[PDB]
Amino acid sequence: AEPEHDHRKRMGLKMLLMMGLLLPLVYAMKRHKWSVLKSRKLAYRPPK
Amino acid sequence: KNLLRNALVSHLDGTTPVCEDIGRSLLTYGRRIPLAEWESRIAEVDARVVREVCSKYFYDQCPAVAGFGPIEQLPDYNRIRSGMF
Amino acid sequence: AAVPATSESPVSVLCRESLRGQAAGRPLVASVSLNVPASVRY
Amino acid sequence: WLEGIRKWYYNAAGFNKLGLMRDDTIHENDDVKEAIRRLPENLYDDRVFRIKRALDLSMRQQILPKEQWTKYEEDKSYLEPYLKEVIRERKEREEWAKK
Amino acid sequence: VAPTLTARLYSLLFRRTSTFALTIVVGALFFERAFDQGADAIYEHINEGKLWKHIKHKYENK
Amino acid sequence: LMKIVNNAFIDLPAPSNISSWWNFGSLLGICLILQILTGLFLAMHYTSDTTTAFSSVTHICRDVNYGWIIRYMHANGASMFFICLYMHVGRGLYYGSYTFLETWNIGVILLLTVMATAFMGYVLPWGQMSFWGATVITNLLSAIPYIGTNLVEWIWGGFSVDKATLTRFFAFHFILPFIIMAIAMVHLLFLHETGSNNPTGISSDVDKIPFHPYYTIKDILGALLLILALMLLVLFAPDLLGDPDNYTPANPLNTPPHIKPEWYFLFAYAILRSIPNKLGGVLALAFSILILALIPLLHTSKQRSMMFRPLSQCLFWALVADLLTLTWIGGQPVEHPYITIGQLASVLYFLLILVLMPTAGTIENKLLKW
Amino acid sequence: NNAFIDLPAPSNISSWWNFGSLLGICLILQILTGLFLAMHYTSDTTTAFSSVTHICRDVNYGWIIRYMHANGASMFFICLYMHVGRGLYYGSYTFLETWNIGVILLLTVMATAFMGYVLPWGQMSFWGATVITNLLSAIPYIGTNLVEWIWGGFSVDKATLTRFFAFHFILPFIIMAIAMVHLLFLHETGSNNPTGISSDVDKIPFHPYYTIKDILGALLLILALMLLVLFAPDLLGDPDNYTPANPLNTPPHIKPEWYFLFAYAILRSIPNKLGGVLALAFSILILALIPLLHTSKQRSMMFRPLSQCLFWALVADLLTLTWIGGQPVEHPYITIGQLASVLYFLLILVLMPTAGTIENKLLKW
Numbered sequence A: 001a002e003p004e005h006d007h008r009k010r011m012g013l014k015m016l017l018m019m020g021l022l023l024p025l026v027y028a029m030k031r032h033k034w035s036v037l038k039s040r041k042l043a044y045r046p047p048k
Numbered sequence B: 001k002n003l004l005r006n007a008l009v010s011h012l013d014g015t016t017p018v019c020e021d022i023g024r025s026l027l028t029y030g031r032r033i034p035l036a037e038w039e040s041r042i043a044e045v046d047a048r049v050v051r052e053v054c055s056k057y058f059y060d061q062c063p064a065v066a067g068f069g070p071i072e073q074l075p076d077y078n079r080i081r082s083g084m085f
Numbered sequence C: 001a002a003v004p005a006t007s008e009s010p011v012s013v014l015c016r017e018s019l020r021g022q023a024a025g026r027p028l029v030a031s032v033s034l035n036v037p038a039s040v041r042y
Numbered sequence D: 001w002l003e004g005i006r007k008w009y010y011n012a013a014g015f016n017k018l019g020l021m022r023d024d025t026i027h028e029n030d031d032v033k034e035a036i037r038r039l040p041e042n043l044y045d046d047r048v049f050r051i052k053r054a055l056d057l058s059m060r061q062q063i064l065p066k067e068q069w070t071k072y073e074e075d076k077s078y079l080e081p082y083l084k085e086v087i088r089e090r091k092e093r094e095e096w097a098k099k
Numbered sequence E: 001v002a003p004t005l006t007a008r009l010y011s012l013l014f015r016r017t018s019t020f021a022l023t024i025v026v027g028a029l030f031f032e033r034a035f036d037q038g039a040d041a042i043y044e045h046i047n048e049g050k051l052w053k054h055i056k057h058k059y060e061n062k
Numbered sequence F: 001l002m003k004i005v006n007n008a009f010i011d012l013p014a015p016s017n018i019s020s021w022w023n024f025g026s027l028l029g030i031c032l033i034l035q036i037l038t039g040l041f042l043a044m045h046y047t048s049d050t051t052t053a054f055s056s057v058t059h060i061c062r063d064v065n066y067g068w069i070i071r072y073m074h075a076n077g078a079s080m081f082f083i084c085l086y087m088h089v090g091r092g093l094y095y096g097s098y099t100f101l102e103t104w105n106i107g108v109i110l111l112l113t114v115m116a117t118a119f120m121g122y123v124l125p126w127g128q129m130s131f132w133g134a135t136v137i138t139n140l141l142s143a144i145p146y147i148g149t150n151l152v153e154w155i156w157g158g159f160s161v162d163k164a165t166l167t168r169f170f171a172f173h174f175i176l177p178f179i180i181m182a183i184a185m186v187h188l189l190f191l192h193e194t195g196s197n198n199p200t201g202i203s204s205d206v207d208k209i210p211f212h213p214y215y216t217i218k219d220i221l222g223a224l225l226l227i228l229a230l231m232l233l234v235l236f237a238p239d240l241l242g243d244p245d246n247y248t249p250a251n252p253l254n255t256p257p258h259i260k261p262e263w264y265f266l267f268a269y270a271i272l273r274s275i276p277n278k279l280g281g282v283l284a285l286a287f288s289i290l291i292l293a294l295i296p297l298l299h300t301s302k303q304r305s306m307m308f309r310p311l312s313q314c315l316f317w318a319l320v321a322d323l324l325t326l327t328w329i330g331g332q333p334v335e336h337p338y339i340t341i342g343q344l345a346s347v348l349y350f351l352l353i354l355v356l357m358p359t360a361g362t363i364e365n366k367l368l369k370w
Numbered sequence G: 001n002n003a004f005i006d007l008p009a010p011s012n013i014s015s016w017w018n019f020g021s022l023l024g025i026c027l028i029l030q031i032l033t034g035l036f037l038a039m040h041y042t043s044d045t046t047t048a049f050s051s052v053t054h055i056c057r058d059v060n061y062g063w064i065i066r067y068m069h070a071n072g073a074s075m076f077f078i079c080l081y082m083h084v085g086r087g088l089y090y091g092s093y094t095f096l097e098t099w100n101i102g103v104i105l106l107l108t109v110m111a112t113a114f115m116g117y118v119l120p121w122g123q124m125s126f127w128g129a130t131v132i133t134n135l136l137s138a139i140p141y142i143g144t145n146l147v148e149w150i151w152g153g154f155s156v157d158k159a160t161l162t163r164f165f166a167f168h169f170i171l172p173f174i175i176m177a178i179a180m181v182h183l184l185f186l187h188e189t190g191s192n193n194p195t196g197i198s199s200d201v202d203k204i205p206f207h208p209y210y211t212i213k214d215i216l217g218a219l220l221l222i223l224a225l226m227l228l229v230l231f232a233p234d235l236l237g238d239p240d241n242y243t244p245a246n247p248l249n250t251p252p253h254i255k256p257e258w259y260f261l262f263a264y265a266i267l268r269s270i271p272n273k274l275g276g277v278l279a280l281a282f283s284i285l286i287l288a289l290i291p292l293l294h295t296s297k298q299r300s301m302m303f304r305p306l307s308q309c310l311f312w313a314l315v316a317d318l319l320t321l322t323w324i325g326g327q328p329v330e331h332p333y334i335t336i337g338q339l340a341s342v343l344y345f346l347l348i349l350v351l352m353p354t355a356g357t358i359e360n361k362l363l364k365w
């Protein structure tokens, strides 16, 4: 009923390993770019 | 190079500019650098040198940016930073 | 030429000190350049 | 307890935690946009800053220290006199539009 | 008077765009070989004795 | 070439604070491309004749190189499509995004078109669920007075579901996704006129950031998570969201005793099943989806988002819990006490949207003195 | 609006400018009849031919939809060739983007019609699929691999028919998107006109002037199409495709669809595999070179006698090649075809650019 049984699991192992690598790396790339905004500081200086 | 040569000599025109170049140069270089030396320094600059020196200071380096006024359109820093390469 | 003008044009005073020197004293002169900001003296 | 639940609600709503005043949170329709356009410089600039400060906190999923929260008792409607007139003017025009 | 690994990786590999790309091409072909061999070994070990490649010797001669 | 790629992406102004709930729009774009790509490749090996449809699908899964992964990616991708669709709609309701009337109403059309599209695709493998799904759903049209039955037979190309039906459904399923793509581009064009809403419901014009690189990288991160969810299903549990009965070829003489709809249609099926009247159930079904077009007219709050509205939030989660209840009921037999739970859940669904939420809105307005 | 209603148009464009809208109509017609045929067509080799006869014999009005689709493809090419001819003669090719997209459109329509012809799986369907895909085998080192990959096997078979239905199904919609881009680039400049002189001083609104003229043109297109469908549906077709595909036998007088005959004559004139394929590709791709070969100081051929004479020689030559493509590879047709093939490239690459320069000289500029 499922001749692809063993192959999908071997692939699934590779998918999990690749995601274990790519997810935190892309997340690191996301935080790198966003750091410009996350640490930005604002100040309001109206005339008075 | 020609623009720079002309700026250097035309700036040192009159006693005040020359006097200032003397006072400030002794404090900055520790000596007065003569025009003939500036000429030698300028003469040796060619396209290769300009590329290498510009790359060293401008290429993929983080800039410092200051804006004032109607600056809604001043690019985001990340975009400015990517413009450096 | 090579030297940029003291003040580049486009299109603050609140004290005596900053005001001294503002009064004109000689006829007007207008300059126009190829490479340098225009000026008007006096 | 309606006034009692009111102060409770105000804090539960929580826009005060981002430093916003109630009028800063109104949904902008054409009446509101006209009212904001009519605001005097200082009220307009203050509004802009409070909204900007709140959007910044929201982006960081953070809130202000409790001592900086807008206080229920000090929140006032700066927009009301302007919006009420804008609405009155539109109603008047709508009445006239009927023959 | 001595740099760090990342500083060296920066200077020789990442700075120039032509070299940042050659680095990825090369790294990709090397990673592919090591990753596939490694993951395949993990999979086959988790399933030791169950795969056709493990019992094949018993029937082969063809 | 530059512009409109761009000023329509690269320098597109975006709120600085949109959250992960705003990632579903791009995830839907990705689900659409995925379905289109895996779809075309499956269509290169699929044959629509009733004598060979089921067979061609097994041929894809057994003999075409990597045919199985493309097939299960298409099947599970349809599930991911709906998960994202429902998250996308939920985000819109909670944050008052529906006030962008054109964008919203086009969205309602998009939901209906994807539902119709997924329906027809499910019919293609010609298994038992394929056949009875084709039978039941097309028959919804028979509730139309005077011509209902005629419309059904016209759609079927005969007096019952047969060869003519399967062949035209392959054609409809083939083209509809591309029509969906064109409709989605219109969806986006209207959105661009206003730009995005944000969690606060307050205009973000005073704090916009460029879409690139902030949301381009955030969307890529989201795309990776979508792919992980999809592949966990394809590689570790490809049949989890499917139905065993569709592994049985279509049998026109016998409807499986525990027949049930695809999981993403269960809530609507529960609603229709709760009304012991033909036309009444069909109208309730249609209305359970079309009511989304009414949400904008039912908005009473002075505030756009539910972020600062406690009471509205409670009712919102009750609606979600209720849809979860209807989903569960749709998977249960029409027996006691499920018949009553489902009727209450069905009534509660329309009551929350038409009455309770608009009322919570007014009460909250009063509590804030405006 | 402003993309139609108030679109500025030259006051003097002639009937030769009607083919663009007629191509749009041919495309819509093919899409509409195509979808309806796809509702009854099955792509399995065991049933493809059968499903087509079923459409023509038992589906209500199936026969008219089918012959409208078949003859519609012929009308599509008549219009395409008229459209390209207008462009060459009047110098419309100077609108570079519009022109090059047009070349892509021609190739895509050719590829599209090729695949559709394979669908009924008759004899011509089968051998056309065989020959044309094999053009790729001329590609060194990997050519044969590309062919087997396209076929899904070592020969044209089931896998081929099924994917061709899918390709033929989607390509026309891609053509539609490419055509919309074709028009967008055109709109940046507006239309050229018979004089080749800017018409900005005399523009008229597209509506009502060209909307009514396009409708009149559409009526004439429909008359031509229906004369073929109702009075001679097989006139432009090939009897051999009424015979189911037979992989063991290639009909002795096999010949391409009439709109491919000129290119087939060119390929057949060269007794070398790679050479023939390169000449075939070049006979179409040379259209992309026309702009670079423009030497005249004037845009249109209206005021250029010598250029006009060479233009009609090219048309007469394509007519010659079309005739030769329909004849057996025997004397004296082999030589006439070789001369005609050489004349084709010679007129475009050398004689026309030269006439352009001579005309400039005669006008003293």
Ligand code: HEM
Binding pocket: F021, F022, F023, F024, F025, F026, F028, F029, F032, F085, F088, F089, F092, F095, F097, F098, F100, F103, F104, F106, F107, F108, F110, F111, F114, F180, F184, F187, F188, F191, F195, F196, F197, F198, F292
């Ligand atoms: C094939 C389906 C769909 C696609 C491809 C799609 C895509 C998008 C995209 C890319 C955005 C911008 C990013 C975002 O905010 O998520 C968006 C926004 C939006 N969509 Fe959709 N959408 C789909 C279905 C729907 C449905 C079913 C509804 C609602 C009935 C809808 C309502 C909205 C609204 C109102 C917005 C504005 C969001 C905001 O700014 O707060 N969409 N959609």
Ligand code: HEM
Binding pocket: F032, F035, F036, F037, F038, F039, F040, F042, F043, F046, F057, F071, F074, F075, F078, F081, F114, F117, F118, F119, F120, F121, F122, F123, F124, F125, F173, F174, F177, F178, F180, F242
């Ligand atoms: C909105 C996009 C799409 C959706 C939601 C969708 C949905 C579905 C569903 C639910 C099935 C049944 C899967 C199963 O076997 O269990 C299916 C099958 C199928 N779809 Fe799609 N589809 C989409 C796009 C496409 C496109 C664009 C094509 C082809 C050009 C296509 C071709 C097919 C084919 C050939 C099948 C039959 C084989 C199979 O069952 O896997 N689909 N589709």
Ligand code: HEM
Binding pocket: G016, G017, G018, G019, G020, G021, G023, G024, G027, G080, G083, G084, G087, G090, G092, G093, G095, G098, G099, G101, G102, G103, G105, G106, G109, G175, G179, G182, G183, G186, G190, G191, G192, G193, G287
């Ligand atoms: C699916 C095929 C095609 C469609 C639907 C199409 C459609 C159009 C339309 C609507 C026009 C405007 C009306 C006209 O002047 O005729 C036009 C103009 C033009 N087309 Fe096409 N076209 C197609 C193929 C091509 C091809 C194959 C070429 C040439 C290789 C081409 C070259 C041009 C040029 C240069 C113009 C500007 C004509 C002028 O203003 O004189 N077109 N096309």
Ligand code: HEM
Binding pocket: G027, G030, G031, G032, G033, G034, G035, G037, G038, G041, G052, G066, G069, G070, G073, G076, G109, G112, G113, G114, G115, G116, G117, G118, G119, G120, G168, G169, G170, G172, G173, G175
């Ligand atoms: C650029 C547009 C198109 C062209 C030039 C074209 C051309 C052709 C040609 C030459 C044939 C052979 C006709 C014969 O002798 O039987 C054919 C067959 C067919 N075409 Fe198209 N076609 C177009 C668009 C479409 C579309 C959009 C569909 C379907 C979605 C379609 C569906 C069919 C079907 C199912 C057949 C097989 C039945 C038959 O042979 O009549 N075509 N097409």
Ligand SMILES: C/C=C(C)/C=C/C=C/[C@H](OC)[C@@H](C)[C@@H](OC)[C@@H](C)CCc1oc2c(O)c(OC)cc(OC)c2c(=O)c1C
Binding pocket: F112, F113, F115, F116, F119, F129, F130, F132, F133, F136, F137, F138, F155, F172, F259, F260, F261, F262, F265, F268, F269, F272, F285, F286, F289
């Ligand atoms: C030619 C094209 C046609 C006729 C398209 C029609 C499309 C109609 C709607 O889409 C817009 C429709 C799919 C959508 O209604 C809003 C669904 C929520 C309806 C869900 C639905 O599913 C079932 C299902 O899947 C089954 O499977 C085995 C069996 C079923 O009962 C035995 C049902 C069922 O009782 C219902 C209500």
Ligand SMILES: C/C=C(C)/C=C/C=C/[C@H](OC)[C@@H](C)[C@@H](OC)[C@@H](C)CCc1oc2c(O)c(OC)cc(OC)c2c(=O)c1C
Binding pocket: G107, G108, G110, G111, G114, G124, G125, G127, G128, G131, G132, G133, G150, G167, G254, G255, G256, G257, G260, G263, G264, G267, G280, G281, G284
């Ligand atoms: C998967 C898609 C694929 C592989 C698409 C390939 C497209 C290729 C080209 O279109 C761009 C091609 C159609 C176009 O070449 C420019 C034509 C003018 C080639 C004309 C052509 O036709 C023949 C034909 O029809 C036949 O019928 C029974 C038989 C034939 O000889 C026995 C030929 C033949 O010898 C040639 C040269």
Ligand SMILES: CCCCCCO[C@@H]1O[C@H](CO)[C@@H](O)[C@H](O)[C@H]1O
Binding pocket: F240, F241, F242, F243, F244, F263
């Ligand atoms: C993400 C986990 C959701 C729960 C998975 C259960 O999924 C359900 O399993 C049934 C068989 O037990 C199937 O008949 C049904 O179609 C399927 O939706």
Ligand SMILES: CCCCCCO[C@@H]1O[C@H](CO)[C@@H](O)[C@H](O)[C@H]1O
Binding pocket: G235, G236, G237, G238, G258
């Ligand atoms: C529009 C005028 C076309 C000229 C009529 C002849 O037409 C030709 O007839 C041959 C057999 O009689 C066919 O084999 C050929 O394909 C066809 O183009």
